[PDB]
């Protein structure tokens, strides 16, 4: 039932695609923030509070 | 265990017992449907110490988000019976 | 646990939570009853000095110094009721909680035992079947457009209706199934 | 040896001319009968071997693997019986045909008096497994997996073939007996180094070595249950059999050359055992556990001592049985939940208690609990490595601890706690699954009574 | 006054000691309101898909699928060769191997020397 | 013929019959627990006979009955050792087990899976009997792992509880940490001595080197919860009370110490290992008593007391007195089992309440448990002509009269003081003050099972020390001469502990409240050891197992090197080769160039 | 604070339904309909079926199989003290050196 656009993509660069990713992950644009854009394959995924 | 199967009458009796013991409430003026803030003029801190007395009494503690919005003995007994799965 | 939280906690809610926690931790400190009563009354007298303060900035400055003090003096091993999230029997009987639908998978030789119970269960299933198709429309019409704003559910308003999404809250297994 | 090969070949006629609804029963019955026949090879001697003919010979290293190979087929049939219910009779018959072909190729591979014939059958075993994974696989990445599972092997296998033919031009024979009796030392030269590497790498890639273990999680996750069973139980043991057979010519160059692979295996067993701790998938977790166990077996083979070989043989047999059982349990979960992730379906012990017992037994035997043969092989390899060098005990102990940790983690996450609420389509376990697990576990606890049956020719 | 509790990675700041919560603004209240609105639409969708009598299967969770796919199959396509990544990979995958090789080679060299000079006392060393 | 062998094998054999009948119909009835209890009691009264035979004669024997696989010159066989230690420990364990199952028949009444509980208890008993009587290292390892697995199963008795599963995994972790040293010792012994048999190991090792003894010490420290690997025993209290009364207090946790008892001839010929054992035991007993001195949960403080007693036993081993350590095992089993039994009766009477802050006056509200616990506390502290006295008086006597460490001596004395102090803490806070439980009183004791089971161990804790000490043959030189003050140190220190702790607890009644110091906070959080060591290593492991292990090498770089570089190279050269526009002009020019190259290159 | 008027109605209906279900959870006197079909004294039988047969079997196996092979059972060679006599030979170990006895 799931679509292609639902899955994580590449690291967001513009505010528009950052916003689109935030809507994808069911979070506010102000609350969304990706991991640092380094070689490690986090890509486009929320860096949630580490809290246990 | 050997615990007697407590019933609604026992819960209400015990709650009214704890309510009567408290000095700030005249025993003859309270009731099952007696409100706390207006019927009896008890403070919010008075309601939280009533919650504390109930928690000590029954051996379990009520969540505060449920505790802060309990203002009558009848609804408190109802909440506790719902928590303890009481038949009658 | 039953009632849904709100979008935030007001100042009075926060002060009540601190009062509750502080009194509980003090009781954990004072094992004997008379000492606990004395220090709890002293605590309540200290607390009620500022009930009539009206400055929002002063109110914010208050209860925060109180929270830091409480964190310093919190009795690193507080008393917990056995069934509380920190108790010694918090989730003892979760291994005894089985769902309702497992009875749907019972062998007919097993279902031959307890026939009245399964007849009543059949009545319950029919009631749920009708009440659900009623509740779908009831919730679809009652909900604010653009999605719900609070996760609290409305009650039933006609005569034959039942509360929306009622089956799995009424049909909880038990507190102590065995 | 033909008394085992011929009935296996006749299974093909038996399945294709069977009634459209009687394929499973006939295949299961005759496979169990063939296992009973293959049990006869266990009567080995302390002398050379069981030289049946110029083409086939048996050994106390070949016999346990042959018996396990014959025994696995009924289990594979019973496991695959479920998810092939909605298939045409032609495709189910093709599936069973692939299974029989794989068993036949393994049977001919494990006797293989000659090295070139061994290589040919050892490479022919690739095709039916590839077809099973790529055709009766669920996801879209299965094709990719197949390519991986192919090319690695071929990249490893091609120099070996060259090495093999070169050997026949210099020695004059590739029969195992002449090779053993006429063996001569290998002078430490560059050409001999490359010969050693060519002879070893083909089997090293299939074990798999820690560096070359990428293919195994993909192949296990993508394969159907029968593919996972045959890959975990037997298809990983081909590398061990090949190295054990081929190391005789490689002396004395083995002592110098073995250091990189020994270091890789000793560190990679820790690395994959730790990887098992953070895994969101059952089949991936069991794949990494298989990598750890086969790394220990690689260490045992490279050490090249009597205790090393005995422990390696015992561990190969035990790990095959245990991994097949664990994959069966995971597939039992998948066919019910259709998710294949550990965290979703939870607290199943309250709901499936006897399957919880099977889970506990499989986890205990994967944990290498004494006196199971898993621990027998583990302890023999550990003692041999300690004799090799006293520092290895640290790594072995770390591996044992992490093994216990991840095995009990895999038991805890799935069986204990509270069930997921929204799940309701979980039906009570069938008799087929319970019989599958019982037939998996009983041979292990029976074999621990007679360990000498699975300790190899160096016993 | 009382001594300050210092938060750490493994012992985080208490909920009631955050300076951020006490700085209240209508923007912050709107943020919390929309957060709870998102939480409530999620809860409503879950309960609607949950209490239906017709449904007899797993409720597929988009969040869990995103979690698993990001963990497993999204790593390499987003990888880039960086000095940090290259150095970390080379270190953590190469250094331990050479370290253990050095340790074991040194130990075996010492043992072989002790063997050749004859003072190792291998009496009763029969199984190897 | 010589009924020693027949009786000593029949005991263990009949211990397993209910396990064989676990598939029968009786397992589906309510009479199974009674069946198991009767079987174990009969086993105990049957094992009483070889003990009498040894007492009369001193008869020792080795029974190698079944021959397992033989590996070249090494021979493995099912061998049982029936020395003084085995024949002495068997009846004590069976007696304590009988008492524990009699208690369980009442405590686990409302448990739907009670037959499974009794089956688990009997499996643990069988595994411990296997461990004790083993003659070779392999059978010892079999028992070693069996008891640990049964402990894991019994701690996580309520699988719906997250913390119970956490405690079970913690016990497994620490026991595997000890297993590292165990396997090290086994490998060393086979490699050098060429056998796993105790006889050949003793024979061929006149001066045992460091490595095997260090491995044995690591295994014993892992199993007995010494200072390095202590917290699993306090955390093991999550399981039901009889499990903690049998396994984690008196039978399983002595096994590691018992292992160091088994190899005492090799322990006596090495001095560094003895020093390490002594120091580890001293630090363990002191730390555990200090932790116990501020605990509110009753099971936790009794568990810490058990840990301190195990540390004392390790000190006794370190001072080269194995027989005294074994005697201390024997008496500790009795009185600690009865202590935990009293605690369990208390907890059941107060609706599963374990914190002592909600427990007040039970001296008169329930008198038999009061007198049993007071006897047990007096015995544990150690008193003249009390069971704990023989083990306690002798241990202090020997450590004081030996060439040991002064620091270990001092920590042992402070440990005795803290032992008396926590005993008076528990009795004071649980039996003397005003009641503090919920008003609904469900206090009851009139149950024959609890009374008989408690009184059997009471009779044991009063008489067994004297009877056994005066019954066994002498095995060591006694300290007959001593300065009067040095003879009395144990009594004076226990009296000071009693008095000082009593006076400190008496100040609680005062209407004054002050904030604790740093020392109390350090003592309450278990020296902060469970915090740091359960958050710092784990995290730094788990993170790595995902970052460097899972993604960095396996998913990226190992993928990059062999397969991905190959794929990219194939892609590029395929594109280069196949990209021809089909103009025969370029093909013909290239053909001419190649013809020229061939004419100029190959000749 | 407190519940809202609408909230009370939901709790009332839900709690009454919960009571109905929880009452339905009870049992009738005939509900466990069991289908029957078949095909000192306690201690006396237990003492022979659980003690006597095992000792018989173990003693047989020890005396006639285990002890048949050498070195399977090895004893302690019991202590010999001065003044005793040995049944097999009949000699007496000589007494000691008559140390001075006082206190
Ligand atoms: C030791 C005395 C035993 C003598 C009697 C002989 C019995 C032979 C049985 C052999 C194994 C059974 C087959 C395995 C699958 C179980 C089948 C099943 O479905 O159960 C249904 C049945 C009823 O279940 P249910 O009520 O319908 O459902 C409830 C739920 O399932 C809930 O399930 P549950 O919670 O009730 O779990 C059932 C139970 C049992 O389930 C199991 O887990 C069975 C597996 C146990 C060990 C796991 C493998 C570890 C490696 C050891 C391998 C040794 C093999 C030796 C030869 C084996 C011969 C076949 O689990 C446990 O209690 C944990 C056991 C862990 C023990 C750890 C220590 C083991 C090593 C100790 C030394 C062994 C050799 C001694 C040598 C020196 C002394 C002479 O359960 C039983 O019948 C219980 C079995 C009795 C306990 C056996 C545990 C010890 C046996 C070890 C191997 C045999 C030793 C041989 C000589 C020993 C002297
Ligand atoms: C459910 C609750 C319990 C009910 C049942 C209670 C009864 C329990 C008894 C069962 C086990 C308890 C231990 C008792 C052991 C007695 C039997 C044992 O002694 O016999 C063994 C014999 O067993 C066999 O050796 C082990 C069987 C090997 C299993 C082979 C696998 C089976 C084929 C299946 C396909 C293979 C798949 C795996 C390929 C390798 C060892 O024999 P051994 O002491 O030496 O010499 C025999 C006498 N000799 C000298 C004349 C020869
Ligand atoms: C990626 C996951 C694992 C993949 C497989 C890894 C295992 C294969 C690695 C092979 C190990 C080394 C190969 C050759 C070993 C020879 C011994 C050498 O290391 O020692 C010195 C050799 O000296 C120098 O090392 C010469 C070799 C230098 C050139 C080799 C390249 C080194 C790095 C390349 C590694 C890349 C491997 C994979 C490529 C695809 C001793 O000096 P010398 O006494 O004079 O030579 C002795 C040999 N004689 C007797 C024949 C003369
Ligand atoms: C029970 C039902 C029948 C009761 C009546 C029979 C009573 C005894 C009569 C049987 C005669 C004895 C017998 O069977 O023969 C001995 C026979 C073995 O023959 P051997 O030649 O001595 O050695 C095997 C190598 N060839 O012994 C037996 O098998 C029976 C007793 C063996 C011990 C019981 C096994 C219990 C442990 C199970 C295995 C545990 C794992 C391995 C342990 C590791 C130990 C380091
Ligand atoms: C001398 C020359 C040596 C040549 C050796 C050949 C090695 C075998 C691998 C050949 C790969 C060639 C194909 C290729 O690179 O294409 C990339 C291709 C693109 O996919 P397409 O299906 O074409 O289209 C997708 C979009 N629609 O990528 C893939 O899918 C490949 C996935 C499977 C890879 C399998 C792993 C192969 C490497 C392992 C061992 C091979 C090493 C060979 C020897 C190494 C030196 C000792
Ligand atoms: C998992 C995939 C890995 C694939 C295996 C890679 C390692 C195998 C080594 C490369 C192939 C070599 C095959 C050689 C076959 C054996 C023949 C032999 O040993 O005979 C030698 C021949 O030796 C050679 O010719 C070796 C030359 C190799 C050329 C191609 C090498 C391919 C690249 C090598 C670099 C990688 C080496 C290690 C890689 C390890 C795996 C990654 C003697 O030659 P003669 O002239 O007849 O002797 C007369 C004089 N005494
Ligand atoms: C052992 C642990 C020690 C912890 C110590 C913590 C320090 C304690 C000292 C606290 C000092 C204060 O009072 S901090 C004072 C914070 N500011 C105010 O209280 C202003 C107005 N007060 C309210 O509105 C309340 O709700 C009220 C009217 C009281 C009740 O309301 P109700 O009518 O709805 O019951």
Coordinates of N, CA, C and O in Angstrom, one line a residue, chain F residues 385-471:
Chain F
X385 N 27.9 -20.7 70.8 CA 26.9 -21.8 70.8 C 25.7 -21.6 70.0 O 24.6 -22.0 70.3
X386 N 25.9 -21.0 68.8 CA 24.9 -20.7 67.8 C 25.5 -21.3 66.5 O 26.7 -21.4 66.3
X387 N 24.6 -21.6 65.5 CA 25.2 -22.2 64.3 C 26.2 -21.3 63.6 O 27.2 -21.7 63.2
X388 N 25.8 -20.0 63.5 CA 26.7 -19.1 62.9 C 28.1 -18.9 63.6 O 29.1 -18.5 63.1
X389 N 28.1 -19.2 64.9 CA 29.2 -19.1 65.7 C 30.5 -19.9 65.3 O 31.6 -19.4 65.3
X390 N 30.3 -21.2 65.0 CA 31.4 -22.0 64.6 C 32.1 -21.4 63.3 O 33.3 -21.3 63.3
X391 N 31.3 -21.1 62.3 CA 31.8 -20.5 61.1 C 32.4 -19.1 61.4 O 33.5 -18.8 61.0
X392 N 31.6 -18.3 62.1 CA 32.0 -17.0 62.4 C 33.2 -16.8 63.4 O 34.1 -16.0 63.1
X393 N 33.2 -17.5 64.5 CA 34.2 -17.4 65.5 C 35.6 -17.9 64.9 O 36.6 -17.2 65.1
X394 N 35.5 -19.0 64.3 CA 36.7 -19.6 63.7 C 37.3 -18.7 62.5 O 38.5 -18.5 62.4
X395 N 36.4 -18.1 61.7 CA 36.9 -17.3 60.6 C 37.7 -16.1 61.1 O 38.8 -15.8 60.7
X396 N 37.1 -15.4 62.0 CA 37.8 -14.2 62.6 C 39.0 -14.6 63.3 O 40.1 -14.0 63.2
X397 N 39.0 -15.7 64.1 CA 40.1 -16.3 64.8 C 41.3 -16.5 63.9 O 42.4 -16.2 64.1
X398 N 41.0 -17.2 62.8 CA 42.0 -17.6 61.8 C 42.6 -16.4 61.1 O 43.8 -16.3 60.9
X399 N 41.8 -15.5 60.6 CA 42.3 -14.4 59.9 C 43.1 -13.5 60.8 O 44.1 -12.9 60.4
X400 N 42.7 -13.4 62.1 CA 43.5 -12.6 63.0 C 44.8 -13.2 63.3 O 45.8 -12.5 63.6
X401 N 44.9 -14.6 63.3 CA 46.1 -15.3 63.6 C 46.9 -15.8 62.4 O 47.4 -16.9 62.4
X402 N 46.9 -15.0 61.3 CA 47.6 -15.4 60.1 C 48.3 -14.3 59.4 O 48.1 -13.1 59.7
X403 N 49.3 -14.7 58.6 CA 50.2 -13.7 57.9 C 49.4 -13.2 56.7 O 49.5 -13.7 55.6
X404 N 48.5 -12.2 57.0 CA 47.6 -11.7 56.0 C 47.9 -10.2 55.8 O 48.9 -9.6 56.3
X405 N 47.1 -9.5 55.0 CA 47.1 -8.1 54.8 C 46.4 -7.4 56.0 O 45.4 -7.8 56.5
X406 N 47.1 -6.3 56.5 CA 46.4 -5.5 57.6 C 45.2 -4.9 57.1 O 44.2 -4.8 57.8
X407 N 45.2 -4.4 55.8 CA 44.0 -3.7 55.3 C 42.8 -4.7 55.2 O 41.7 -4.3 55.5
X408 N 43.1 -5.9 54.7 CA 42.0 -6.9 54.6 C 41.5 -7.2 56.0 O 40.2 -7.4 56.2
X409 N 42.3 -7.4 57.0 CA 41.9 -7.5 58.4 C 40.9 -6.4 58.8 O 39.9 -6.7 59.3
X410 N 41.4 -5.2 58.5 CA 40.5 -4.0 59.0 C 39.2 -4.0 58.3 O 38.2 -3.8 58.9
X411 N 39.2 -4.3 56.9 CA 37.9 -4.3 56.2 C 37.0 -5.4 56.7 O 35.8 -5.3 56.7
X412 N 37.6 -6.6 57.0 CA 36.8 -7.7 57.6 C 36.2 -7.3 58.9 O 35.0 -7.6 59.1
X413 N 36.9 -6.6 59.8 CA 36.3 -6.2 61.0 C 35.2 -5.2 60.8 O 34.1 -5.3 61.4
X414 N 35.4 -4.2 59.9 CA 34.4 -3.2 59.7 C 33.2 -3.9 59.0 O 32.0 -3.5 59.2
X415 N 33.4 -4.9 58.2 CA 32.3 -5.7 57.6 C 31.5 -6.4 58.7 O 30.3 -6.4 58.6
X416 N 32.2 -7.0 59.7 CA 31.4 -7.6 60.8 C 30.6 -6.5 61.5 O 29.4 -6.8 61.9
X417 N 31.2 -5.4 61.8 CA 30.4 -4.3 62.4 C 29.2 -3.9 61.6 O 28.1 -3.8 62.1
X418 N 29.4 -3.7 60.3 CA 28.3 -3.4 59.4 C 27.2 -4.5 59.3 O 26.0 -4.2 59.1
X419 N 27.7 -5.7 59.5 CA 26.7 -6.8 59.5 C 25.8 -6.7 60.7 O 24.6 -6.8 60.5
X420 N 26.4 -6.6 61.9 CA 25.6 -6.3 63.1 C 24.7 -5.1 62.9 O 23.5 -5.1 63.3
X421 N 25.2 -4.1 62.2 CA 24.4 -2.8 62.1 C 23.2 -3.0 61.2 O 22.1 -2.5 61.4
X422 N 23.4 -3.7 60.0 CA 22.2 -3.9 59.2 C 21.2 -4.9 59.7 O 20.0 -4.8 59.5
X423 N 21.7 -5.9 60.5 CA 20.8 -6.8 61.2 C 19.9 -6.0 62.1 O 18.7 -6.1 62.1
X424 N 20.5 -5.1 63.0 CA 19.7 -4.3 63.9 C 18.8 -3.3 63.1 O 17.7 -3.0 63.5
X425 N 19.3 -2.8 62.0 CA 18.5 -2.0 61.1 C 17.2 -2.6 60.7 O 16.1 -2.1 60.9
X426 N 17.3 -3.9 60.1 CA 16.1 -4.5 59.6 C 15.2 -4.9 60.8 O 14.0 -4.6 60.7
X427 N 15.7 -5.4 61.9 CA 14.8 -5.8 63.0 C 14.1 -4.5 63.5 O 12.9 -4.5 63.8
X428 N 14.9 -3.4 63.7 CA 14.3 -2.2 64.3 C 13.2 -1.6 63.4 O 12.1 -1.3 63.9
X429 N 13.5 -1.5 62.1 CA 12.6 -0.8 61.2 C 11.4 -1.7 60.8 O 10.5 -1.2 60.2
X430 N 11.5 -3.0 61.1 CA 10.4 -3.9 60.7 C 9.6 -4.5 61.8 O 8.6 -5.1 61.6
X431 N 10.0 -4.4 63.1 CA 9.4 -5.1 64.2 C 9.1 -4.2 65.4 O 8.3 -4.7 66.3
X432 N 9.7 -3.1 65.6 CA 9.6 -2.4 66.9 C 8.7 -1.1 66.8 O 8.0 -1.0 67.8
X433 N 8.8 -0.3 65.8 CA 8.0 0.9 65.8 C 6.5 0.7 65.6 O 6.0 -0.5 65.7
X434 N 5.8 1.8 65.4 CA 4.4 1.7 65.2 C 4.1 1.2 63.8 O 4.8 1.5 62.9
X435 N 2.9 0.5 63.7 CA 2.6 0.0 62.3 C 2.5 1.1 61.3 O 2.1 2.2 61.6
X436 N 2.8 0.8 60.1 CA 2.8 1.8 59.0 C 2.2 1.2 57.7 O 2.4 1.8 56.6
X437 N 1.5 0.1 57.7 CA 0.9 -0.5 56.5 C -0.5 0.1 56.3 O -1.0 0.8 57.2
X438 N -1.1 -0.2 55.2 CA -2.5 0.3 54.9 C -3.4 -0.3 56.0 O -3.2 -1.4 56.5
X439 N -4.4 0.5 56.4 CA -5.3 0.1 57.5 C -6.0 -1.2 57.3 O -6.2 -1.9 58.3
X440 N -6.3 -1.6 56.1 CA -7.0 -2.9 55.9 C -6.0 -4.0 56.2 O -5.1 -4.3 55.5
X441 N -6.2 -4.6 57.4 CA -5.3 -5.6 57.9 C -5.7 -7.0 57.3 O -6.8 -7.5 57.6
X442 N -4.7 -7.6 56.6 CA -4.8 -9.0 56.1 C -3.7 -9.8 56.7 O -3.2 -10.8 56.1
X443 N -3.3 -9.5 57.9 CA -2.2 -10.2 58.5 C -2.6 -11.5 59.0 O -3.6 -11.6 59.8
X444 N -2.0 -12.6 58.5 CA -2.3 -14.0 59.0 C -1.1 -14.8 58.8 O -0.2 -14.6 57.9
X445 N -1.0 -15.9 59.6 CA 0.1 -16.8 59.6 C -0.4 -18.3 59.7 O 0.4 -19.2 59.4
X446 N -1.6 -18.5 60.2 CA -2.0 -19.8 60.6 C -2.1 -20.7 59.4 O -3.2 -21.0 58.9
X447 N -1.0 -21.2 58.9 CA -0.9 -22.1 57.8 C 0.2 -23.1 58.1 O 1.4 -22.8 58.4
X448 N -0.2 -24.4 58.2 CA 0.8 -25.4 58.6 C 2.1 -25.5 57.8 O 3.1 -25.8 58.3
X449 N 2.0 -25.3 56.4 CA 3.1 -25.4 55.6 C 4.2 -24.4 56.0 O 5.4 -24.7 56.2
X450 N 3.8 -23.1 56.1 CA 4.8 -22.1 56.5 C 5.4 -22.4 57.9 O 6.6 -22.2 58.0
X451 N 4.6 -22.8 58.8 CA 5.1 -23.0 60.2 C 6.1 -24.2 60.2 O 7.1 -24.0 60.8
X452 N 5.7 -25.3 59.6 CA 6.6 -26.4 59.6 C 7.9 -26.2 58.9 O 9.0 -26.5 59.3
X453 N 7.8 -25.5 57.7 CA 8.9 -25.2 56.9 C 9.9 -24.2 57.6 O 11.1 -24.4 57.5
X454 N 9.3 -23.2 58.3 CA 10.1 -22.3 59.1 C 10.8 -23.0 60.3 O 11.9 -22.7 60.6
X455 N 10.0 -23.9 61.0 CA 10.5 -24.4 62.2 C 11.6 -25.5 61.9 O 12.5 -25.7 62.8
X456 N 11.5 -26.2 60.8 CA 12.6 -27.1 60.4 C 13.9 -26.4 60.3 O 14.9 -26.8 60.9
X457 N 14.0 -25.3 59.5 CA 15.2 -24.5 59.4 C 15.5 -23.8 60.7 O 16.7 -23.6 61.0
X458 N 14.6 -23.6 61.6 CA 14.9 -23.0 62.9 C 15.7 -24.1 63.8 O 16.7 -23.7 64.4
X459 N 15.2 -25.3 63.8 CA 15.9 -26.4 64.5 C 17.3 -26.6 63.9 O 18.2 -26.8 64.6
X460 N 17.4 -26.5 62.6 CA 18.7 -26.5 61.9 C 19.6 -25.4 62.4 O 20.7 -25.7 62.9
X461 N 19.1 -24.2 62.4 CA 19.9 -23.0 62.7 C 20.2 -23.0 64.2 O 21.1 -22.3 64.6
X462 N 19.6 -23.8 65.1 CA 20.0 -23.9 66.5 C 20.9 -25.0 66.7 O 21.9 -24.9 67.5
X463 N 20.8 -26.2 66.1 CA 21.5 -27.4 66.5 C 22.6 -27.8 65.5 O 23.5 -28.5 65.9
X464 N 22.4 -27.6 64.2 CA 23.3 -28.2 63.2 C 24.7 -27.8 63.3 O 25.6 -28.6 63.1
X465 N 25.0 -26.5 63.7 CA 26.3 -26.1 63.8 C 27.1 -26.9 64.9 O 28.2 -27.5 64.6
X466 N 26.5 -27.1 66.1 CA 27.1 -27.9 67.1 C 27.3 -29.3 66.7 O 28.4 -29.9 66.8
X467 N 26.2 -29.9 66.2 CA 26.3 -31.3 65.8 C 27.3 -31.6 64.8 O 28.2 -32.5 64.9
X468 N 27.3 -30.8 63.7 CA 28.3 -31.1 62.6 C 29.7 -30.8 63.1 O 30.6 -31.6 62.9
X469 N 29.9 -29.6 63.8 CA 31.3 -29.3 64.2 C 31.8 -30.3 65.1 O 33.0 -30.7 65.0
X470 N 31.0 -30.9 66.0 CA 31.5 -31.9 66.9 C 31.5 -33.3 66.2 O 31.9 -34.3 66.9
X471 N 30.9 -33.4 65.0 CA 30.9 -34.7 64.4 C 32.0 -35.0 63.4 O 32.5 -36.1 63.3

